[PDB]
Amino acid sequence: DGKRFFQADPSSRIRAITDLIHEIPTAHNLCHFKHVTDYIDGLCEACCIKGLLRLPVFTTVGGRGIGAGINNTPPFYLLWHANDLAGMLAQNWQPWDNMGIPAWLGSFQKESREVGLLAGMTWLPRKVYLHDPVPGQAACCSCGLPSEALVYSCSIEVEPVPKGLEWKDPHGVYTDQGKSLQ
């Protein structure tokens, strides 16, 4: 009962859990997919979390009506790598003077532009509520690890990314004209 992680204002539109993830096929303009079917099998909690982290980074266009993420169409992502998590964090540490207001706080105040890095790296273009049914699953058949009762669907809306916001992702790659490099 309170604030929730990567969740936002009240919702009405309901979409299946298959579209939060991208690697598994979703409800396209078809009926058959790569042997998946919506509202039958769902993802685990870890898969749901790793799909929620895909939202600020790898959200594409939804047919030119649904807007993209904060860093446009998802560009090339480049970073510095090491054999350890300590070297993982240390080699990509370069911070900026203004941090920003990340989305794991509540409803952030828009105020002026030039968010920084911490507000821009965690921008939420979608929402999640999910309606919990009475009990749930018995054996998992979508993730692969046989788990307890899992999710079935969710609820996704969009937020229009405004104009301006002169901002550069630290790991993104941007062309000569400032557009995203694909």
Partner DNA sequence: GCTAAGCGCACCTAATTTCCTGACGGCAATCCT
Q: Is 27 in the site for DNA (CB under 7 A)?
A: yes
Question: Minimum CB separation from DNA for residue 125, in Å?
Answer: 14
User: By CB under 7 A, is residue 28 in contact with DNA?
Assistant: yes
| Position 97, amino acid | D
Helix (H) or strand (E) holding 121: none
- Is 48 annotated in a binding site? The answer is no
Residue 14 binds DNA (CB under 7 A): no
Q: Does 26 bind DNA (CB under 7 A)?
A: yes
Contact 6, 104 (CB under 8 A): yes
Binding piece for DNA, criterion CB under 7 A, among 42-50, 59-67, 107-115, 147-155: 59-67
73 interacts with, out of Mg ion, DNA, none, CB within 5 to 8 A per kind: none
Identify which range of 58-66, 111-119, 144-152, 160-168 contacts DNA by CB under 7 A: 58-66
**Half-sphere exposure in the Cβ direction for 121 (13 Å, CA):** 12
139: which DSSP letter?
A: S
Q: Assess 32 for contact with DNA (CB under 7 A).
A: no
Instruction: Report the nearest approach of DNA to the CB of residue 30 (Å).
Output: 8
Single out the segment in contact with DNA by CB under 7 A; choices: 25-33, 89-97, 119-127, 171-179: 25-33
Question: Encoding tokens for residue 68?
Answer: 């993209």
| Helical segments of the chain, H only | 45-52, 85-90
| Sequence letter at residue 166 | E
Count of Cβ atoms closer than 10 Å to residue 27 Cβ: 15
CB atoms within 10 A of CB 173: 12
Q: In which residue are the tokens 């965690």 written? A: 122
Taking the least distance from each CB to Mg ion, the nearer of 106 and 136 is 136
Least distance in angstroms from the C-beta of 69 to Mg ion: 23
Q: Tokens representing 146?
A: 């046989």
Q: Residues in contact with DNA, total (CB under 7 A)?
A: 8
State the binding site for Mg(2+): 47, 140, 143
